[PDB]
Design a protein around this ligand. Structure first.
Ligand SMILES: O=C(O)c1cccc(-c2cccnc2)c1
Ligand code: NA
Lengths: 306, 304
């Protein structure tokens, strides 16, 4: 029993984190095979960041301008190149701790673990969802750039996120490992803002199933609804539309608990319309939307990663 | 910016997790140097759950009754002894991944990370606090016994918890790494119930200071309180008493934000009286109590 916001074990990623220094800027890099990945804004001074020409700034740098420390061991940079908003530093040594890995781009609503790091040294791990507005509600201080997000599927690490910047509301923006931003953001010091966010409906439903599995049942009722009917309520309360594919994905949890998705949707409609009436669900007074269906199944079934 | 329930990176502990089998029972062990630590109830059979005599059960075992598997490798057990409620298995290989470590017994209100494991392989990492009733609110399935809790301040792993059992309310009980249970619990299946739990007041105050540091002041008020009047109110809401030690411990956060500790207590008193009126604090609609003063300073900026 119990249900906690849970990260993947971070050991496989910890062995890939290095410190990257260019001039006065130190941040984190990801060392995999013989390449170190980090944000291309590592090469900018503060005035550069106002309106950077990245190809032009890069041309002045020699390999020896990139100091890379893995632990207390210097790495030798033998090449450099840019892919979208990430810098790739070719180094003379393959990382002997490189895990089995892939670069994947995730979809809004999907979750991943963040290994927050400073000076190439991991300092904390936590679980994030990619919001519908393509931000993440992370916890990052100065020096965290280049920290990464990831999932583990069997023995393979799927890297999905690299941290680049904080937005004025305190939420965070970054890229996939091929340098493509999540969301309508740019790596430049300019006026940028998170769009209005919404709630991830399929995730809230997953978490209600987690609650039932853990004995929290007071919100269940006799009613059911239709997709069309529910999605009208969803739109009214700033919830993402629920699709038929969402219902299919929740199939397992519906069969395990005996509560059909639209049965549970009727529960959620009543909570949105009437609130929680001073009660809580899995210790929360808010409807939690950063557990996917897969997250709930895996935590309520004990899948392991060694 | 931002504030998250943040665990320590688990890699240093992952490298120590092994599987221990005795008879038909498999659970997790912690392999440090040449010793594997695990819950002594691995030697119980279904016959033994209510009143096991661990000394009598242990004297009947030889080294080779214990199977220890580190990854795909069998370690050879060359000695065994029992210390309180943990079993210590001497093995013929020191763990090459042993970090700098120590064993620490923690006090209620302290937080730590849990590396949930099954069959010697890590499943997930999350953050916990030791409740005032000496339980923890974990996420543990059958087979998770021997999973450990830890902090890593300054590259040394302080092991503070080993998971032993689940109580009927769904909360969890365990030992320090010297095998002494937290609280009054015992490794028997005789009926045991956690005491009434209470909110960790000093942690709530810390988290309110975290909210101010991150730029939120909506819950403050113009009042102050004496420490005794604060306690007289807060215990009516099942809050732990706040001691002068706690007041002293909050000094640094008070200095950073410019809000006196007893002024923050007055803000908490009013929050308990009013609720949040639809608002949130650091993204929560409840007052959060599993962040310590030390956690807040470690996660937050120092600038506010
Ligand atoms: O101290 C003991 O030996 C003991 C024996 C039986 C039961 C309990 C116990 C422990 C915790 C809660 N309720 C009961 C302790
Ligand atoms: Na229903």
């Amino acid at each position: 029993s119990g249900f906690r916001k849970m990260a993947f074990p971070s050991g496989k990623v910890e062995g890939c984190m290095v410190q990257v220094t260019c001039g006065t800027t130190t941040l984190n890099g990801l060392w995999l095979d013989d390449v170190v990945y980090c944000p291309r804004h590592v090469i900018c001074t503060s005035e550069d960041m106002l309106n950077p020409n990245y190809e032009d700034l890069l041309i002045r740098k020699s390999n020896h301008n990139f100091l890379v420390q893995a632990g207390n061991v210097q790495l030798r940079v033998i090449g450099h190149s840019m892919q979208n908003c990430v810098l790739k530093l070719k180094v003379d040594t393959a990382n002997p701790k490189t895990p089995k890995y892939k670069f994947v781009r995730i979809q809004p609503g999907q979750t991943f673990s963040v290994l927050a790091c400073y000076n190439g040294s991991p300092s904390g791990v936590y679980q994030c969802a990619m919001r519908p507005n393509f931000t993440i509600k992370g916890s990052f201080l100065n020096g965290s750039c280049g920290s990464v997000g990831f999932n583990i599927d069997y023995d393979c690490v799927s890297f999905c996120y690299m941290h680049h910047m904080e937005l004025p509301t305190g939420v965070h923006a970054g890229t996939d490992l091929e340098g493509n931003f999540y969301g309508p953001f740019v790596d430049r010091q300019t006026a940028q803002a998170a769009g209005t966010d919404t709630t991830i409906t399929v995730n809230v439903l997953a978490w209600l199933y987690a609650a039932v599995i853990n004995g929290d049942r007071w919100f269940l009722n006799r009613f059911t609804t239709t997709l069309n009917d529910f999605n009208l309520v969803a739109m009214k309360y700033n919830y993402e539309p629920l699709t038929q594919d969402h219902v299919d994905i929740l199939g397992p949890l519906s069969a395990q608990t005996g509560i059909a998705v639209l049965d549970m949707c009727a529960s959620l409609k009543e909570l949105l319309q009437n609130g929680m009436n001073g009660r809580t669900i899995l210790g929360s007074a808010l409807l939690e939307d950063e557990f996917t269906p897969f997250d709930v199944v895996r935590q309520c079934s004990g899948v392991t990663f060694q």
